[PDB]
Amino acid sequence: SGFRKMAFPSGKVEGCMVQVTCGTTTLNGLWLDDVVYCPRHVICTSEDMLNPNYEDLLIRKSNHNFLVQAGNVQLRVIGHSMQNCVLKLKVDTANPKTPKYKFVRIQPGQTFSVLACYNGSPSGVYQCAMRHNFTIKGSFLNGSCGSVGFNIDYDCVSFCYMHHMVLPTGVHAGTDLEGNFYGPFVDRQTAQAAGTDTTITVNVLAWLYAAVINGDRWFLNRFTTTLNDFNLVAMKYNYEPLTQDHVDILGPLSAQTGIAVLDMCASLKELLQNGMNGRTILGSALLEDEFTPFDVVRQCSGVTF
Amino acid sequence: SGFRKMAFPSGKVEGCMVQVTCGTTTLNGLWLDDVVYCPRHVICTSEDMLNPNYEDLLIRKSNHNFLVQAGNVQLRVIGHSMQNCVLKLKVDTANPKTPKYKFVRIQPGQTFSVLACYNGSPSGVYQCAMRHNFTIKGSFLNGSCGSVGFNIDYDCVSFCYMHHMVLPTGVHAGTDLEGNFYGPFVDRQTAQAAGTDTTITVNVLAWLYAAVINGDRWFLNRFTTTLNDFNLVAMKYNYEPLTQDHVDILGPLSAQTGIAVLDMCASLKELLQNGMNGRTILGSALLEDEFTPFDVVRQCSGVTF
Ligand SMILES: *[C@H](O)[C@H](C[C@@H]1CCNC1=O)NC(=O)[C@H](CC(C)C)NC(=O)OCc1ccccc1
Ligand SMILES: *[C@H](O)[C@H](C[C@@H]1CCNC1=O)NC(=O)[C@H](CC(C)C)NC(=O)OCc1ccccc1
């Protein structure tokens, strides 16, 4: 079977990427129906981004100050509005490639596929996870703002993320498609700090079940533990405490493998207290937390979209 | 900037995936122009795959024994031929989504994007590398044969791989788009063995340059070495010996970072002899070899397609 970090097919999202220019700044936009979405710091100069009054900066902008290009075609902007931290440019033409789509705000631990773009052209795709402190470890350069993160449920494209900025620690932050930032961040060039990032515990547990499926079992110990005792060990190691909801999610994996949920927590307790001793699990020398329980069954059962 | 394992946008390849049925076996096909490509073991039963006379098995097959479905549409097969290990089904309709494409046979160490499919529908995309023994560590289930590996150069899709089988050691093997197998493998259910897999040395060296670009430098030692002396250390550690061609490829990275090529080899010699001591490089506790020097500059300069 094998296990790789997989992303959804980006075919539907590529047809919705446009180039947005306003003055001397250019970023990518999401063209769905007759509305174009993009970050609001496109109306900023290099000196504006230090500290911006986006309201005052937007007063000085009309419809013709926005250059929207769809490939080699130009879209005529007939209206603009600021919803939180995103612009909504009203164009006179509907996108003929608009798929079944919907806007969703995700929770920490959930995974999505990012389509990194520059000048409105797709450059690549990779898998990411909303971390505990509402940041991601993405791959973004200058001009990548407007790149979107999404999930695919058969033919429906659930858009959940749009890139905005990078933090001093190299991690990235962004908003949903309504403009609300994931985390306590703001769109300014100010030293901002993400808080303490704890490991998604349920994601590591689901990843261990994927290892048992593909043959890695050296870590299966024959011990048990309680949630209250395992959580007290997980708190020393900066891990998410486990709830009954996390156990119920890992139910299908617990029944498919015949390994109890609390039994797997005992193996994770030993992996934290004893390290790994130079071994690997699924080809990795670290506990991997980018994989939701749905990501494990989707790859171990072959769901098509 | 960040550094992730990135794959090309799969938008152009999704429109070329069809479902091919022959008797009781169904796999995926590559529909370019008026020709459909697919593995030849589709004309096999479960008992045939033990030891197959593909010539005798193909004599008993006519044009109407092949069911080709493009989404909800059926393509009429008007001809068939066996080129090595792939079938070439002649359909009466050209694919209106055919991109600029070309067939290429790649060398060990080169990377490509795999679009895993089932029933002709894309399920996901990930990055792979042709290993030293002409195998890959992919993610394939039953029915994934016909999934293709490709690279994208702006608008040209270079197809290089088509899945066929999995080995006893969980690794996978396949052919190019002409039917010739990468490696000494054959399309039979026989115990087959891949040889000794050595680490792509130039790929690890280019990955270390990507670490210096993004800020990881704890491994920069202030030693030097010769190629003849570094290769003798690399031979003990099952690494590819280094040539002047590998040095010339790492030239641009060597000039961009100001770190000499032979200087970086001295740091890799220390990383092999001393281990990693619980540290990480770009978030990994292992030396990563899935990244060609082109993959590093494409992600560190933001090339668009
Ligand atoms: C949008 O294209 C860009 C993406 C950045 C550039 C490098 N990596 C990224 O993810 N975002 C910005 O340039 C952004 C603009 C603000 C008005 C939101 N600023 C930014 O990310 O600068 C980095 C930084 C800002 C403040 C403190 C420390 C670093
Ligand atoms: C094609 O759909 C399929 C993909 C396999 C199934 C599981 N993982 C994969 O990559 N290929 C085969 O089923 C293939 C058929 C031969 C006629 C080429 N056989 C195969 O991969 O079986 C595994 C195996 C064969 C021989 C020795 C040990 C294992």
Author numbering:
A (entry chain A), B (entry chain A): 1 to 305
From the reporting publication:
Paxlovid targets the viral protease nsp5, also known as the main protease (Mpro) or 3-chymotrypsin-like protease (3CLpro). Nsp5 cleaves the viral polyproteins at 11 sites, releasing nsp4 through nsp16. It contains a catalytic dyad Cys145-His41 that bears similarities to that of chymotrypsin. Because nsp5 is enzymatically active only as a dimer, studying the monomer-dimer equilibrium is essential for understanding the full effect of mutations and inhibitors on nsp5 activity.
To study the effects of E166V on the structural interactions of nsp5 with the inhibitors, we solved the crystal structures of E166V-nsp5BA.1 in complex with either NIR or GC376 and compared them to existing WT-nsp5BA.1 complexes. When crystallized in complex with E166V-nsp5BA.1, GC376 forms a covalent bond with Cys145; to relieve potential steric interactions with the β-branched, bulky, and inflexible Val166, its benzyl group assumes multiple conformations through strategic repositioning from its location in the WT-nsp5BA.1 active site. However, in all E166V structures reported here, the N terminus changes orientation as Val166 cannot form a hydrogen bond with Ser1′. In contrast, E166V-nsp5BA.1 only showed this tight binding with GC376, not NIR. With GC376, E166V-nsp5BA.1 markedly shifted to a mostly dimeric population, similar to WT-nsp5BA. In contrast, the addition of GC376 caused significant shifts in Ti for both WT-nsp5BA.1 and E166V-nsp5BA.1 proteins. However, GC376 still inhibits E166V-nsp5WA1 and E166V-nsp5BA.1 with similar IC50 values as the respective WT-nsp5 proteins. Hence, the strategic torsional flexibility of GC376 allows it to avoid steric conflict and structurally adapt in a changing pocket, enabling covalent binding, inhibition of E166V-nsp5, and evasion of resistance.
